[PDB]
Coordinates of C-alpha atoms and ligand atoms in Angstrom, one line a residue:
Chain A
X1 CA 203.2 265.5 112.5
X2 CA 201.5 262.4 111.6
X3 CA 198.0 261.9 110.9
X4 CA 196.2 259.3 108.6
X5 CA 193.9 259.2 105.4
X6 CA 191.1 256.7 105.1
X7 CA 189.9 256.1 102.0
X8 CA 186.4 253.2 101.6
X9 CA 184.9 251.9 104.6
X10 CA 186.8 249.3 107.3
X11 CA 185.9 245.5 106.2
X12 CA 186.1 245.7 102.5
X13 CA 188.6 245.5 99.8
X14 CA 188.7 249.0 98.5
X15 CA 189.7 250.3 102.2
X16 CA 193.1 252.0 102.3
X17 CA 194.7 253.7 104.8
X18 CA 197.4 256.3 104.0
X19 CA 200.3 257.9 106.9
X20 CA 200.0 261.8 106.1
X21 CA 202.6 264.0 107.3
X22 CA 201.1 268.1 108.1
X23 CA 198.4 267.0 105.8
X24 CA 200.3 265.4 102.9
X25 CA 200.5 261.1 102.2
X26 CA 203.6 259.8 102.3
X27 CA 205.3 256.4 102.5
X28 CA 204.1 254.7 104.8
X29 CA 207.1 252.0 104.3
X30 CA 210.0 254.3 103.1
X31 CA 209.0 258.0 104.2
X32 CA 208.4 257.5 108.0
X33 CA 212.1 257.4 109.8
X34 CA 213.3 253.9 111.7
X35 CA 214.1 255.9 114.6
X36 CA 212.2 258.9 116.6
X37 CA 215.6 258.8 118.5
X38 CA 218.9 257.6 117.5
X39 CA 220.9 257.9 120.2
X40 CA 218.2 256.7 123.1
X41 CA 217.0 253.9 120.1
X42 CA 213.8 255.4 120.2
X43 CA 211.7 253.9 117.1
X44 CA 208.5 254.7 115.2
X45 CA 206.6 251.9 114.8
X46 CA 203.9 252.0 112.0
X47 CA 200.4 250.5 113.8
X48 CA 198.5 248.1 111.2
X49 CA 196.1 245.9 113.6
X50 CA 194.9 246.6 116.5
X51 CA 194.7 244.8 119.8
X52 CA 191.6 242.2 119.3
X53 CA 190.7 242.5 116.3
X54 CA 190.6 240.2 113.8
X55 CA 191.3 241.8 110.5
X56 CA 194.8 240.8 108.6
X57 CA 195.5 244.6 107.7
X58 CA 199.2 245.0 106.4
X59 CA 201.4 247.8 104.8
X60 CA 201.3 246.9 100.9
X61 CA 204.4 246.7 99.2
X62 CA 203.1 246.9 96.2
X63 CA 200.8 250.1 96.0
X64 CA 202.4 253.9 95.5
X65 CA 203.0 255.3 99.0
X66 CA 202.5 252.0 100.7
X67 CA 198.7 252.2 102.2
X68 CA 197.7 249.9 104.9
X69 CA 195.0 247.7 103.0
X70 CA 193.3 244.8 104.2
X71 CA 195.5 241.2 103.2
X72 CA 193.2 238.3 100.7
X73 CA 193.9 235.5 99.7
X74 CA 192.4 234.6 96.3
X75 CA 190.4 237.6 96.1
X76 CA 188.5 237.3 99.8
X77 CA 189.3 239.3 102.5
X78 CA 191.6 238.0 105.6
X79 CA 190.3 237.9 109.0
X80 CA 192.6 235.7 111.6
X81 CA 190.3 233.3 113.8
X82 CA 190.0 233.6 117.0
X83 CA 192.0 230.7 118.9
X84 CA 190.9 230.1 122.8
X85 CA 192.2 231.7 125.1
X86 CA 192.8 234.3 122.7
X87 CA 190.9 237.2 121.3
X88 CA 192.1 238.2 117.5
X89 CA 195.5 239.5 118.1
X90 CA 197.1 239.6 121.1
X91 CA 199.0 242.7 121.0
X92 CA 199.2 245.8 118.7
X93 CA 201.2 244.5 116.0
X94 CA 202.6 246.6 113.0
X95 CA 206.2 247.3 111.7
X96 CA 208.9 249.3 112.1
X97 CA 209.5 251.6 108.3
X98 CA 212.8 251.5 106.8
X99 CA 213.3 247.2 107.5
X100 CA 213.3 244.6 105.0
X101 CA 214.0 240.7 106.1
X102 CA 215.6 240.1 102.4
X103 CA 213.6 236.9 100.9
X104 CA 217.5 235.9 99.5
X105 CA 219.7 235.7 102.1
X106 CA 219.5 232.5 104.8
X107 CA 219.7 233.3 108.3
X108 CA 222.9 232.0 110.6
X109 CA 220.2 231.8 113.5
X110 CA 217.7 230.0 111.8
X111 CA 218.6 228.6 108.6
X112 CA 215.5 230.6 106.4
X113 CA 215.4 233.0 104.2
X114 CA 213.5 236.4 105.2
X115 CA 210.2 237.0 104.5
X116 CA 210.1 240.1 102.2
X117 CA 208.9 242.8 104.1
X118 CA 209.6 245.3 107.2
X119 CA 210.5 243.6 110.4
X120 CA 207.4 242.7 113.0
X121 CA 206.9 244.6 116.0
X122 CA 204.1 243.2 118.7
X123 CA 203.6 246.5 121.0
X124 CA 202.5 244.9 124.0
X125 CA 201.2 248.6 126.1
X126 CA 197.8 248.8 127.6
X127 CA 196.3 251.3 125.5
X128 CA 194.8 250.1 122.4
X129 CA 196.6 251.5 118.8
X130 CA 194.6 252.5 115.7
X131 CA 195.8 251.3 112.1
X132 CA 197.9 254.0 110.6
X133 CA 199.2 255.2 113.8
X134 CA 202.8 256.5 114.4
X135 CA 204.1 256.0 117.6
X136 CA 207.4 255.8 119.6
X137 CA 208.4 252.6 121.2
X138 CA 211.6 250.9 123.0
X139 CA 212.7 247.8 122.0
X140 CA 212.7 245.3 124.9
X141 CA 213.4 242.0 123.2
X142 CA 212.7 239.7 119.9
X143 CA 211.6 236.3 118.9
X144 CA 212.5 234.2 115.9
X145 CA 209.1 232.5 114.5
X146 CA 209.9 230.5 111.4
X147 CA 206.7 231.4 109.4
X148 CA 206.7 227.9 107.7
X149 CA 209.8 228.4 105.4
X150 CA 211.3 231.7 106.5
X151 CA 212.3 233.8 109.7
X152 CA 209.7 236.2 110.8
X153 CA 211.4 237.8 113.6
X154 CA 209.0 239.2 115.7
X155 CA 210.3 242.6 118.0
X156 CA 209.2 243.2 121.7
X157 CA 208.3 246.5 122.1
X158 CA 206.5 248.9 124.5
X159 CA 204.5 252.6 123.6
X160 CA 207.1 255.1 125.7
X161 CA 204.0 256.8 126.8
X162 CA 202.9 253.5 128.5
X163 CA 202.5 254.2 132.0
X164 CA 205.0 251.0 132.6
X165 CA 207.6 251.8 130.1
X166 CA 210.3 253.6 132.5
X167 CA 209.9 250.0 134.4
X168 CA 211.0 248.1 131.1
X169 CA 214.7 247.9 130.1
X170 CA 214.7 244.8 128.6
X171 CA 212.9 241.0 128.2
X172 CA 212.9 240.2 131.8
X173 CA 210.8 243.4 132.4
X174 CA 208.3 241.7 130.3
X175 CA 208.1 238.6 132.4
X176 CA 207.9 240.6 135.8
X177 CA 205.0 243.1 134.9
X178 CA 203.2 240.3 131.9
X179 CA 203.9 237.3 133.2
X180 CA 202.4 234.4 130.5
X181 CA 202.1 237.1 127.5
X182 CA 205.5 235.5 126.4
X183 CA 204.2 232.3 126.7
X184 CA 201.2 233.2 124.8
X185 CA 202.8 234.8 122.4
X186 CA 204.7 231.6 121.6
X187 CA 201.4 229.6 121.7
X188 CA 199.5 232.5 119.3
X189 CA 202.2 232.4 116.4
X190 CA 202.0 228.6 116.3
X191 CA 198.7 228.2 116.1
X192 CA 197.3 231.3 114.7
X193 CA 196.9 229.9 110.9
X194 CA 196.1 226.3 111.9
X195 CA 192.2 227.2 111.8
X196 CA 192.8 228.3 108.3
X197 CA 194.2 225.1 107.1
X198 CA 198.2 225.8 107.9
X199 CA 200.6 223.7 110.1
X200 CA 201.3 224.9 113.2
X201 CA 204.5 227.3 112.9
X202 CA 207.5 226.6 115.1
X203 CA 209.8 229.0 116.5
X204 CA 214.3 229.0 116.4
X205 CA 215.7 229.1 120.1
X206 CA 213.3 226.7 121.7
X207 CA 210.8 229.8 121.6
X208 CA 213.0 231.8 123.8
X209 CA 212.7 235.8 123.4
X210 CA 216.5 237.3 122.7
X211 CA 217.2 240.0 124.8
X212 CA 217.3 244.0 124.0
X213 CA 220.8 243.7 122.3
X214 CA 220.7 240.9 120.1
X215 CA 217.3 242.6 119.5
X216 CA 218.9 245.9 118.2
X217 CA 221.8 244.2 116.2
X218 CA 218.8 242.5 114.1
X219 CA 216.9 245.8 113.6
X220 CA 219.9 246.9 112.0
X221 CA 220.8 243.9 110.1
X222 CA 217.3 244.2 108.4
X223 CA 217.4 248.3 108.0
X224 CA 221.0 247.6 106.5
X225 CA 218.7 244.9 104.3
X226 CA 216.2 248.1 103.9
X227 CA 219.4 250.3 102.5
X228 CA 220.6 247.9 99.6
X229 CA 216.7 247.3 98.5
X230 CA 215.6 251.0 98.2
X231 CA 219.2 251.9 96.5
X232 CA 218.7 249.8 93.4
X233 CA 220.8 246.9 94.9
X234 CA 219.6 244.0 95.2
X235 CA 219.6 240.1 93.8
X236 CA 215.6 240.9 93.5
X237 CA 213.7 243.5 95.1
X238 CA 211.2 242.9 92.5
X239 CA 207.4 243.9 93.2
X240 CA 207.6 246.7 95.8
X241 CA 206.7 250.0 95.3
X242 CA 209.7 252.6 96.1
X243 CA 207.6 255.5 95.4
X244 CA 208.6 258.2 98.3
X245 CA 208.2 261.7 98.9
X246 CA 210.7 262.8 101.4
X247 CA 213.9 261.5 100.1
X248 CA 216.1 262.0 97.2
X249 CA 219.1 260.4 97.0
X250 CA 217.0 257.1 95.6
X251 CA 216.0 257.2 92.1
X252 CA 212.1 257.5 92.7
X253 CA 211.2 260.5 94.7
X254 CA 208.3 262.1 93.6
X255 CA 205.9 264.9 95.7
X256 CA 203.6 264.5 92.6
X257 CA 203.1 261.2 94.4
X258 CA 202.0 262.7 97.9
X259 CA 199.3 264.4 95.8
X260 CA 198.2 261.7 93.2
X261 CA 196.1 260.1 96.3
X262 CA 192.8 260.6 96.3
X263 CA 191.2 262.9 98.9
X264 CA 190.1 261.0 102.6
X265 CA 186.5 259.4 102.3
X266 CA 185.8 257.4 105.2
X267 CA 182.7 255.4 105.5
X268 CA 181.0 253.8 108.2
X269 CA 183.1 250.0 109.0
X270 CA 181.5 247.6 107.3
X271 CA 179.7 244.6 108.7
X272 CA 182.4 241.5 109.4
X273 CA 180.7 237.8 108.9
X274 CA 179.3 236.3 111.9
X275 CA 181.5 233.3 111.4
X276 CA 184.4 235.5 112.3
X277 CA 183.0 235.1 116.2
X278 CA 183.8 231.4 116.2
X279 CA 186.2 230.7 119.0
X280 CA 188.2 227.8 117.4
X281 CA 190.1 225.1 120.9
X282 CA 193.2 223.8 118.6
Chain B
X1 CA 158.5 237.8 118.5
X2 CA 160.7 239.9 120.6
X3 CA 162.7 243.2 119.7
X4 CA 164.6 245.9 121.8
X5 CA 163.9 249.4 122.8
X6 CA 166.8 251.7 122.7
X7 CA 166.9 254.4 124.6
X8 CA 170.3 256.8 124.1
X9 CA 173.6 255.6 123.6
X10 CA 175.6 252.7 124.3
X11 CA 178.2 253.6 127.2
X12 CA 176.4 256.3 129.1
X13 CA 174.1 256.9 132.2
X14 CA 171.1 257.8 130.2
X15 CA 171.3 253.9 127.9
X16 CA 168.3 251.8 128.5
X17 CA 167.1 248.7 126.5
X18 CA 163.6 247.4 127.0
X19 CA 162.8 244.0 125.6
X20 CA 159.7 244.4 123.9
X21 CA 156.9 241.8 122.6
X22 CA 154.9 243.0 119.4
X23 CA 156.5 246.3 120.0
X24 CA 155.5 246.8 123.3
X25 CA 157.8 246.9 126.5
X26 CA 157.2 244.0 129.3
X27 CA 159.3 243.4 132.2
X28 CA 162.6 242.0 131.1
X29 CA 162.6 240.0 134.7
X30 CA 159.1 239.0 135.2
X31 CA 157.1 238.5 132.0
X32 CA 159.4 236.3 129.7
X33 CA 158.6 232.6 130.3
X34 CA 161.0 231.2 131.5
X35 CA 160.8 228.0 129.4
X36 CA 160.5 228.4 125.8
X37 CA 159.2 224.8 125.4
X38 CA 159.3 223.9 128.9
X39 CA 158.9 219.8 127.4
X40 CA 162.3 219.6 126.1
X41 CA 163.9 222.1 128.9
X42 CA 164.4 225.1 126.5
X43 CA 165.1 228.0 128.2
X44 CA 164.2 232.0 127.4
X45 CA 168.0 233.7 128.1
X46 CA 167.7 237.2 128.3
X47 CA 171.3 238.4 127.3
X48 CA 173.0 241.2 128.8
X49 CA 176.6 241.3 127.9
X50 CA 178.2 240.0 124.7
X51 CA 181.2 238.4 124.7
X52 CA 184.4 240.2 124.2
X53 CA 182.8 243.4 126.2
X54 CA 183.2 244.9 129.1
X55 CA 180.4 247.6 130.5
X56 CA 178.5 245.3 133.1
X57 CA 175.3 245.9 131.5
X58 CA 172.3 244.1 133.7
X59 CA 168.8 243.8 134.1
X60 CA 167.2 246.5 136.7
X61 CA 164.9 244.9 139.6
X62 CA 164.0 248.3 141.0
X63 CA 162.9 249.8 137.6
X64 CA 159.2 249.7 136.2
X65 CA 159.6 247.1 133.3
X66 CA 163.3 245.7 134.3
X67 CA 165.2 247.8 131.3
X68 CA 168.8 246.8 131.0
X69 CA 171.2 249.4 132.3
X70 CA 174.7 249.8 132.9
X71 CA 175.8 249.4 136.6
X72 CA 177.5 252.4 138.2
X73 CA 179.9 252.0 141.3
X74 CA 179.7 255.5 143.4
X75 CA 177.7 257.2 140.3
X76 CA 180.3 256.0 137.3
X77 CA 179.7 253.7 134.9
X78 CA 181.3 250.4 136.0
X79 CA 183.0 248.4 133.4
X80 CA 184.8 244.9 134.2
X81 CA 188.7 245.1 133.5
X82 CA 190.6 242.7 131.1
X83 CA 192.3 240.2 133.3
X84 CA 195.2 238.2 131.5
X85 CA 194.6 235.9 129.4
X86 CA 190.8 237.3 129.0
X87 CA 189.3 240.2 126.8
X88 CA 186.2 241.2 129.0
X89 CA 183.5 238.7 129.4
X90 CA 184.3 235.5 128.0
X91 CA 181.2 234.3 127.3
X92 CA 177.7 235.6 125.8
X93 CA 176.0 236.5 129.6
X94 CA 172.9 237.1 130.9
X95 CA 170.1 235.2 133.1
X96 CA 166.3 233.5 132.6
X97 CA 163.6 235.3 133.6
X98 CA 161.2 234.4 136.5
X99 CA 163.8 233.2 138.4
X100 CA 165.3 234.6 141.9
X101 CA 168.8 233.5 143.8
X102 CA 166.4 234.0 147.2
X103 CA 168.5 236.6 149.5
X104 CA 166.0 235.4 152.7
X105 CA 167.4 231.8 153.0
X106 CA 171.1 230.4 153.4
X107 CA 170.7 227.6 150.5
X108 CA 171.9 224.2 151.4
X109 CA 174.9 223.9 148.6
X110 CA 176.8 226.7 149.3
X111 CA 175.9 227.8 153.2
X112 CA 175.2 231.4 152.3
X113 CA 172.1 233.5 151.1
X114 CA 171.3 234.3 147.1
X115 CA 172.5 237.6 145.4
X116 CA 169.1 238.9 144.9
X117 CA 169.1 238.4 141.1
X118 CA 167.8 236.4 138.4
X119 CA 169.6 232.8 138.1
X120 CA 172.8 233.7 135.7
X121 CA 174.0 232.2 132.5
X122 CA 176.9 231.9 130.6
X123 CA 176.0 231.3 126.8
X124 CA 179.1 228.8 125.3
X125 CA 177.8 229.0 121.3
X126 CA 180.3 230.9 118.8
X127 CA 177.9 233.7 117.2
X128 CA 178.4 236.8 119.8
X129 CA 174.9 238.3 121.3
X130 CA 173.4 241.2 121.7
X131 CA 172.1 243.2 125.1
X132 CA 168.1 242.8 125.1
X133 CA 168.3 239.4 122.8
X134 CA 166.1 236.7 124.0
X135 CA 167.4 233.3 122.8
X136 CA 166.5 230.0 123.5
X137 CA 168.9 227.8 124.9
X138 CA 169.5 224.3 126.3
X139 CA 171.1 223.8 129.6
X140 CA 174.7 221.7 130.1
X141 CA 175.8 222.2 134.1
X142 CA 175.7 225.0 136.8
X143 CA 178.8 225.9 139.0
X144 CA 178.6 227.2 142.2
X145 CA 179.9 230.2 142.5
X146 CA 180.1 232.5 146.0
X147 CA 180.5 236.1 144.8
X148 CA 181.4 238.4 147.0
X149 CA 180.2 236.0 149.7
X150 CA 176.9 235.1 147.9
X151 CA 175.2 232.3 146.7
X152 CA 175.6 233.0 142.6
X153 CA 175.3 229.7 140.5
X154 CA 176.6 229.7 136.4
X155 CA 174.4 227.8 134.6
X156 CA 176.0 226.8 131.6
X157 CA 173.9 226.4 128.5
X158 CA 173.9 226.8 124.4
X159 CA 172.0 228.6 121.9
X160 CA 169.9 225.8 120.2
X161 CA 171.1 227.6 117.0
X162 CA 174.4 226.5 117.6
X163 CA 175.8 224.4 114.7
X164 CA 177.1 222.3 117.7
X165 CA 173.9 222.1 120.0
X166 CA 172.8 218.8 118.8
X167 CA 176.6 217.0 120.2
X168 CA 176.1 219.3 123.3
X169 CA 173.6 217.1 125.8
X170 CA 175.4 217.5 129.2
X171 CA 178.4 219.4 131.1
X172 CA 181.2 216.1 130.2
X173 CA 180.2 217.8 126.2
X174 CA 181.3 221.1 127.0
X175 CA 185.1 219.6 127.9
X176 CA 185.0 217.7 124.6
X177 CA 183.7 220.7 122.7
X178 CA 185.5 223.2 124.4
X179 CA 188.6 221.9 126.0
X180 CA 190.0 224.5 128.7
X181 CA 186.6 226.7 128.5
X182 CA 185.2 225.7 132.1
X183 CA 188.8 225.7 133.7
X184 CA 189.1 228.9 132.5
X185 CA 185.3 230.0 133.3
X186 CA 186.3 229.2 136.9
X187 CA 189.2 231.2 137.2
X188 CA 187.4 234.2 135.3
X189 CA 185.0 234.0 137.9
X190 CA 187.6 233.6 141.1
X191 CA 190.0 236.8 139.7
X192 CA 187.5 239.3 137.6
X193 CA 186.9 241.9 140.9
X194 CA 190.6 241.6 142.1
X195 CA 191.3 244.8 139.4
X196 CA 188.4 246.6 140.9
X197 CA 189.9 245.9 144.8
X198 CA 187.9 243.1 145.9
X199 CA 189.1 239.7 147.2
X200 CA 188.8 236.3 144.8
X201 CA 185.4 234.9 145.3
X202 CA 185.6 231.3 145.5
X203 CA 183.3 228.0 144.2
X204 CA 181.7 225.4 146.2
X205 CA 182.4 221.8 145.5
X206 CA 186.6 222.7 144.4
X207 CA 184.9 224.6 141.6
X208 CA 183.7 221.5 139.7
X209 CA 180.5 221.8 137.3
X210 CA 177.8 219.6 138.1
X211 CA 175.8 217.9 135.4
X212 CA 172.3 219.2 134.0
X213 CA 170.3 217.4 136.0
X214 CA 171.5 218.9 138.9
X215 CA 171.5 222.3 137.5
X216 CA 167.8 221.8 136.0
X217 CA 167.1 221.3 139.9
X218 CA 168.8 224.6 140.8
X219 CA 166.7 226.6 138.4
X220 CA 163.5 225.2 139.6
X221 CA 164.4 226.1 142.9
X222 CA 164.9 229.8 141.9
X223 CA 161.8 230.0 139.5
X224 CA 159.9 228.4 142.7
X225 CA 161.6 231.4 144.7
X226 CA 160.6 233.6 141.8
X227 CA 157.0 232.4 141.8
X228 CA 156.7 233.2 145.4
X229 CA 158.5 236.7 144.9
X230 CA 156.0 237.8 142.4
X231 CA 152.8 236.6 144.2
X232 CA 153.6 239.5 146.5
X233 CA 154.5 236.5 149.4
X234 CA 158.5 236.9 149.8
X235 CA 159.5 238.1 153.5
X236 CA 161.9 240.7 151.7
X237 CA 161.0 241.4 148.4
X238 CA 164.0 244.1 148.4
X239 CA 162.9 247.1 146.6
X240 CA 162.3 244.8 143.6
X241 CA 159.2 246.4 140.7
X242 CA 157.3 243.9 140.9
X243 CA 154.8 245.5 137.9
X244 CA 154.6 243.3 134.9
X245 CA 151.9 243.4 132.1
X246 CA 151.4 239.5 131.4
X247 CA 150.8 237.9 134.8
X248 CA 147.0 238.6 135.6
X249 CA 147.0 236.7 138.7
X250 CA 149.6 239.1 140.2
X251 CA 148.9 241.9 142.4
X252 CA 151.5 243.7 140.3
X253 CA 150.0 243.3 137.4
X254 CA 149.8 246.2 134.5
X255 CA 149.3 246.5 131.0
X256 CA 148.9 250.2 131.4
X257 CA 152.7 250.2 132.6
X258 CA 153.8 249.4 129.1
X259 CA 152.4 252.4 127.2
X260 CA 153.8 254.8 129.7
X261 CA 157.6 253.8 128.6
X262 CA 159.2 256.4 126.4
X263 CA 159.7 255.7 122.9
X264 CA 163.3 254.3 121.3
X265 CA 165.7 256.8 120.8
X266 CA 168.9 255.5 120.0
X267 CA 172.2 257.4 119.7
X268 CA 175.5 255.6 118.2
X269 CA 177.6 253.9 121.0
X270 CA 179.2 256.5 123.1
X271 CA 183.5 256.3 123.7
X272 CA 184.8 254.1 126.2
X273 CA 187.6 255.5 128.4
X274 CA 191.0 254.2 127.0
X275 CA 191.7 253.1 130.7
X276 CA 189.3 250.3 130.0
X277 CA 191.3 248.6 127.6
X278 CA 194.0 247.8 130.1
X279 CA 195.3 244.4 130.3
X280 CA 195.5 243.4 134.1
X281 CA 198.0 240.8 135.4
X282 CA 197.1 239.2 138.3
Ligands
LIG301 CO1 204.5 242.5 108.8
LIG302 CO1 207.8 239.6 109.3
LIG303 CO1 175.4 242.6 139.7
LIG304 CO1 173.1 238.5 137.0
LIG305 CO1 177.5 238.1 140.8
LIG306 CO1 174.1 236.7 140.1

């Protein structure tokens, strides 16, 4: 039973958001399973940023238990700009726990090396998510954005509690019942950093969304990527924090961990800078 | 200097925002001047909706004092649904006073009568307003919109405040500016009712948007309208209040009417019903 733990107020650098399980933080990377349901491929997917907002908020790798804290970049907070027609981001977007796309191994579909951290899922549902939140999605497809230097596959997926997910099998769902949100997600994770500076990304396939299956074989590939890391294995898993407090047969278990967090003690969001309105025609 | 008056909270029946001058209420419709510095064409706006929101928060002719209220369809709140690509409104909206789209007369351009409201505007500047704000704003075009059957011009226009209002002088600017922004202000326009089960509206002249000459010749027609209105001399003055406290040579007038509004009683914005956040299709 998953609940979270805000610590600071939303909009500043000491917010932190901890998963708690009946009460008690956990990994938010490592302690929260891949799958809700094996055998139907049933997944959790960890919820950092909501729907339209703008704030970069990310599971860290490198704090104990793996809070959701907001991203900087030479000390300042990150805030993607918005980039006509769009709003912030365009979907829920967060991660699936227990994936890693290892940073040394290059990619037979795309030639890059993987970007360090849990796989990408954009949860496309109508009902807007909340950072921190746990909840059950199907896999209907995946996309393979080259994040200038390294694939950043990006999953399809849908809340099962969506009042359209018994419609939605698999990617051609998606263009039926959201006709253009493929195309704009193509369009988003192109231009997404070019307001900050950054070339437009580009994406492996012509931009072309892989169906259900190749999407499931990748999940794997990068939870199999997930196994070597958190077992000691690995050319250089250097930097993240394996800190968990659900499962043992990994060096670094530790329930002292769960409570070494400071209690919950949410403020008020903080005010964001008016500049982040700006709507930026790129 | 002008202020709000809060009464309740955000996203209920009870919400109410007076516009007040020295901390006094006056008729949101009839008692802001129009022009702001009627030499240069600078316009009073009166804002309604911010961009990005939904709750279709308006002006109200039949109240004493024109408050800004939410609009209810049947008794319930009425909020305007997300329509693909769009997040709620898409731009800052709201109208100038002492103007009227007169109901009592087919006008000319469009071959059907006026919607009974104040002449609207759509705000194009990047900082994101706020319900009650007055700003002062320079007018770019007008579009000719037939909602619901009804004569309903767009005047386009931008906060003088605007880092970019000095390069915006007329409607071929806004293109420049703002590539995509009219296309997609005319199909906002054509598709945002279809989720609540009305037909597309439609534009006269294919939808273009005339210049600013020909738009400041549309809103001196409905402040002449307006003028005529509040002189007690329209055939059909609809229901409207017609009590204001700064025009002495009114029938209507009041400064009495002022000291019998209730004081400001805010309450933090109320929930919006998840159902609101859905993302329609069309
Ligand atoms: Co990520
Ligand atoms: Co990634
Ligand atoms: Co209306
Ligand atoms: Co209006
Ligand atoms: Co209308
Ligand atoms: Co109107």
């Amino acid at each position: 039973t998953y609940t979270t733990r805000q610590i600071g107020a939303k909009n500043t650098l000491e917010y932190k958001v901890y998963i708690e399980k009946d009460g008690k933080p956990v990994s938010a990377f490592h302690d929260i399973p891949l799958y809700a349901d094996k055998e139907n491929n049933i997944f959790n997917m960890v919820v950092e940023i909501p729907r339209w907002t703008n704030a970069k908020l990310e599971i860290t790798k490198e704090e104990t238990l793996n809070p959701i804290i907001q991203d900087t970049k030479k000390g300042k907070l990150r805030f993607v700009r918005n980039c006509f027609p769009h709003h912030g981001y365009i979907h829920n977007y967060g991660a699936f726990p227990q994936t890693w796309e290892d940073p040394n191994v290059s990619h037979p579909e795309t030639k890059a090396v993987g970007d360090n951290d849990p796989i990408d899922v954009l949860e496309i549902g109508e009902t807007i998510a909340y950072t921190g939140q746990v909840k059950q999605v199907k896999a209907l497809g995946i996309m393979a954005l080259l994040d200038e230097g390294e694939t950043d596959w990006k999953v399809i997926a849908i809340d099962i509690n969506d009042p359209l997910a018994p419609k939605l099998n698999d990617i051609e769902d998606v263009e039926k019942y959201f006709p253009g949100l493929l195309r704009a997600t193509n369009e988003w994770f192109r231009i997404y950093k070019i307001p900050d500076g950054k070339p437009e990304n580009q994406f492996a396939f012509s931009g072309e969304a892989k169906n259900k299956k190749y999407a499931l074989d990748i999940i794997k590939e990068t939870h199999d990527s997930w196994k070597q890391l958190i077992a000691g294995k690995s050319s250089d898993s250097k930097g993240i924090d394996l800190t968990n407090v659900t499962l043992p047969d990994t060096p670094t278990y530790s329930k002292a961990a769960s409570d070494a967090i400071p209690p919950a003690s949410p403020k008020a969001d903080a005010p964001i800078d008016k500049s982040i309105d700006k709507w930026f025609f790129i």
